[PDB]
Design an enzyme around this catalytic site. Structure first.
Site, PDB file in Angstrom:
ATOM      1  N   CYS A 163      93.875 142.556  35.106  1.00  0.00           N
ATOM      2  CA  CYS A 163      93.381 141.334  35.746  1.00  0.00           C
ATOM      3  C   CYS A 163      93.366 141.460  37.280  1.00  0.00           C
ATOM      4  O   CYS A 163      92.488 140.917  37.940  1.00  0.00           O
ATOM      5  CB  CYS A 163      94.193 140.108  35.305  1.00  0.00           C
ATOM      6  SG  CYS A 163      95.987 140.284  35.410  1.00  0.00           S
ATOM      7  N   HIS A 186      99.771 137.250  35.864  1.00  0.00           N
ATOM      8  CA  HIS A 186      98.367 137.208  35.538  1.00  0.00           C
ATOM      9  C   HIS A 186      97.563 136.757  36.757  1.00  0.00           C
ATOM     10  O   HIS A 186      97.958 135.842  37.466  1.00  0.00           O
ATOM     11  CB  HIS A 186      98.182 136.263  34.357  1.00  0.00           C
ATOM     12  CG  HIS A 186      96.767 136.119  33.915  1.00  0.00           C
ATOM     13  ND1 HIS A 186      95.930 137.200  33.734  1.00  0.00           N
ATOM     14  CD2 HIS A 186      96.044 135.019  33.600  1.00  0.00           C
ATOM     15  CE1 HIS A 186      94.743 136.768  33.350  1.00  0.00           C
ATOM     16  NE2 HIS A 186      94.787 135.450  33.260  1.00  0.00           N
TER      17      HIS A 186
END
Ligand SMILES: [Zn+2]
Ligand SMILES: [Zn+2]
Ligand SMILES: [Zn+2]
Ligand SMILES: [Zn+2]
Lengths: 331, 350, 330, 342
Positions: A12, A261
């Site tokens: 990510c 994340h």
């Protein structure tokens, strides 16, 4: 609407950055328009593989693109990349832009990313107990601002201007006067970039617990930004071409300092949320939602569990803005 | 027949420096060769004034039959960092030296010539940051006119020169920020010598302040320095040779000495006559002969340090051993490189 | 009470010059204050040393003339050894001497004195008339060499330096910037003026027909007082100290290849230094100045046949000024 | 590929030079690296020149368009003070001199070295060797181009040799030795003291004719090589006979047609050759020696002319030929060109 990017495992940090670069018209169109011995082929291959991604992001009707080619090509400071390991998204941004400008020069082209994202500081030392003044130019690709001792962008930007007093025992050595002199050391902005990338310094190391640690402190930043008060010229006007910016991009990080994340809120040249495979709509035009999703801080969580008890616990907003992208108003 | 310089009151800081420049041949012949010498607009004339009066002085040092010259024009002309000079007040001889080479270079540039003193005296460091916890390395060039060596925590020039190379380890909480890696990383900060000057001026850092006493002080610690010096171990090449990726030898030519207290005290210069067909002591108006060829005399006049004084008083009837400090010692060393009138210092560049 | 110098055979060119340098206070006192390529430096110091000795005896000794044996032995002219019976150009001697003395000083640590006292410079100017460029470089000089054949007096021939030459037509100047030929004035202005200005009257040249050196004995007047301002960079620029007095005339008499040199010099009053004898003279008077230094033709009134024939014949004044020495008022 | 430059009317003299500068890497990357650019008149003017050249170099590096229109440069640029008539032809070397001078002034004023003088600038040693006396006289004279004679030589080497051979100042035209105070037979010659990293060589093809009241062009045959050793024309090289000195040809600024009009364009090597003719940058056969010869060396030939029927044979001149050659030294992005000095 838009095409996403698949996450290999913990990539990510790649996606959030690439997608932000993709959404700068100047870099998108710049990159797509391009027709020690190993390092040169490496860098070109990175540029070449970024093009492909950009191509598919413009072209595809498919919901996401898998960049298998980039994943195999990319190395982070030479060493091989474990696609299951999380990495600092800024560290990734720095490695990519160096390589792209390295790759451009290598094909006789001008350094694009440096031009679009590069600014410089005038590092000024004003001596107060003697008449000397010293300055050098120092370049930057990101502006790195304090989060722990300031509650908003303007106040932390002013810290560059305020400087530090180098005084008493910790005094600055004036080379000419051959002595220690009380001295203001400050940083003013000399050259403002067309795209201003700002790092919120949320990450550090906890010695007592042997691990990386995240500061989720409350910190707010505006939709419109005037950089004049922090520029050399601006400070000269006080002391005796566009300086205005609009927020176009927020790279968010969510979760722990080690893992967590990454995802990117970005403007349509309204706001869309780019989160690996899925590029959704969002309420980033709303200020309360901008606040809850990006400014961080503490709140009183109202916890329920089968909804029979109600607990009231202090919670940290562990999802928050890490990097801001601002576009110069003449760009 | 060496000509001295008159002291106005506390101007030995000018004389000692000026004399040391006069005795560097390339500078002497360079400065004397500059024709056309005889707010922004004010400063160019000021600087050329400085150059002009130095030429005059140099002229009289080279020529006069007198025991000394009185440089009134210079005294009237010279201004230290803007302010006009009180001739009765002592100043750091290195400040004076800095102000003087800056003005000379700015005069020569305004006249289309190169920055002579920066060419003769100027070197540069490579300020290297070597990250140990990441593959990055950062370098930038920093110029110097004087090399400044620690005297308190070293006993000789070679070891204190080694400190530049050994560097400082930026570690733990005080660790270097690698801006590419975007983290704190353990790192060696050090200075290697990138460009060596034809004449290498070295400051022994003998002065500081005391907060308890509210006065400047002098450290009179022992510190030795050799007559021949090899600078290779401290250069970029020499350290790259040792690590695995023009002359570097130097002869001592001058010692500018300070004698006495940090506030006042007295400056004078020991200098070699550069000859084909030895050392002289230049002390304001009197240029006397001296025994600086001998190592024991060198040591007593320049190396500083403590000793046991045999003190005699009570009309010679009492002998007392008192610990004494040598308050007279080397402040600035001048070293001249082995491969040193150069025509390219006078040529027009703009 | 001035002391002469013995002529070895044809060394009047040495004496005429040496005696002229002795009488420059600043050069006398400067010299008297000084106490393959390896031998060049040693040669030059010999020359300085030996001149110092001559200067020593001229001041101190009370003999009617000094004999400079060591200087004769020492001195060489452009490498080669001097034949003491061979006549030479007194200016060549002067140039070779001032070079040697400055070379000797520079090596000994001192600054070039004679260059300081006698040296000037020119701004060599080129002013393009067909384009906007101008070029200037700096040339140096020890003597100023003036035309005698086409001018009748010093001021007008000095003026010629300023008038310059027009580089025109097919002979035009190449402007390096414009990359073409353009009509240009090339002139010499005096950038630096020396405390002592030495000036050559260009009386000597070669005749190809006769295979020998020629002397031009043309009339040529020069003032006792000279203003050099009109010939200087600054004087021309203003218009679009610098005052001198005459202090020495180095005369040459007779034929171009041979002939004889002597020096008229000011002390307060003029004295004629002619090798060994230093008689007084009437150079204070303007008609004597004219008859001894200015040259030119005259109608000679010749008497022969035991004073029974008077005949009028054109005559040249073959005795005349070669090198003028002027001193700057301050 | 490559970006052209629009001709404004008669400004192929600008384009032909600029393009040759653009293709020198040390100049390209040097000029683009200068920040702080984006009697009083001249400091602004010269920096403006530099700035407007930077934008051109900008567009030549970047653009995907076939040509760039340098409107800012045309407004900015003045030739020896006067505003430039964009319809007038000019000497391409006259342009070049004005432009390098201006760029060097801009750079010096910004604290940097005189970049173009570092890269294109050499110097002669103007020697005068007296033969009738032991004196020798020598002064340094700088140059931005080497100017070689076309009319009395057939090739570069022989005409470079001319510099060394010199002229004998003799007889009545003999040299005045200041020290000897006489006329003396003397060799006057120019040897090369400093060789630049790029060597620009003017072939002196233009003069004035007095009979016909007009400028004229000599289209004589003159050949030059692809590889050039400059050692025999330098000070040291002659000092032997009594940093590399080898050069690779990288550039030929050609002129075509009449002395006071005509057209400039530039053959330049790909660091394979390309023809830069204003807006059109085309491939060419300059690697072949016959093509090099026909396009650049000049000289006469027998033209075969065809008409309707008629096949006439008339002697004719190659009025298209090399004016300026650019050679690049073999030992040639250098940081020391962009460092601060003042
Ligand atoms: Zn200071
Ligand atoms: Zn790193
Ligand atoms: Zn011109
Ligand atoms: Zn000669």
């Amino acid at each position: 609407g838009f095409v996403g990017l698949k996450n290999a495992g913990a990539t990510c940090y790649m996606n959030s950055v690439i997608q932000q670069l993709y959404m700068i018209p100047s870099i998108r169109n710049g990159i797509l328009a391009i027709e020690t011995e190993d390092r040169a082929a490496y860098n070109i291959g990175v540029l070449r593989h970024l093009q492909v991604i950009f191509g598919h992001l413009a072209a595809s009707r498919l919901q996401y693109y898998v960049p298998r080619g980039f994943w195999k090509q990319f190395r982070l400071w030479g060493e091989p990349v474990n696609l299951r390991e999380q990495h600092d998204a800024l560290e990734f941004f720095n490695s990519l832009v160096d390589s792209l400008d390295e790759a451009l020069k290598a094909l006789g082209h001008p350094a694009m990313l440096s031009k679009v994202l590069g600014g410089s500081f005038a590092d000024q030392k004003i001596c107060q107990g003697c008449p000397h003044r010293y300055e050098c130019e120092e370049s930057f690709t990101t502006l790195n601002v304090d989060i722990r001792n300031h509650q908003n962008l303007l106040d932390s930007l002013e810290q560059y201007v305020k400087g530090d007093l180098l005084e008493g025992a910790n005094a600055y050595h004036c080379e000419k006067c051959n002595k220690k002199v009380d001295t203001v050391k400050r940083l003013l902005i000399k050259k403002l970039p067309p795209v201003l990338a700002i790092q919120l310094k949320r990450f550090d190391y906890d010695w007592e617990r042997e691990c990386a640690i995240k500061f989720n402190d409350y910190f707010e930043f505006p939709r419109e930004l005037d950089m004049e008060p922090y520029t050399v010229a601006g400070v000269a006007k006080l002391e005796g071409g566009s300086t205005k910016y609009r927020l176009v991009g927020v790279l968010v990080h969510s979760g722990q300092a080690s893992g967590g994340h990454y995802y990117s809120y970005i403007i349509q040249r309204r706001w869309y949320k780019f989160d690996d495979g899925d590029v959704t709509e969002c309420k980033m035009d709303d200020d309360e939602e901008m606040k809850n999703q990006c400014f961080g801080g503490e709140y009183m969580g109202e916890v329920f569990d089968m909804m029979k008890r109600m607990s009231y616990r202090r919670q940290k907003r562990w999802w928050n803005a890490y990097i801001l992208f601002y576009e110069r108003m003449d760009t």
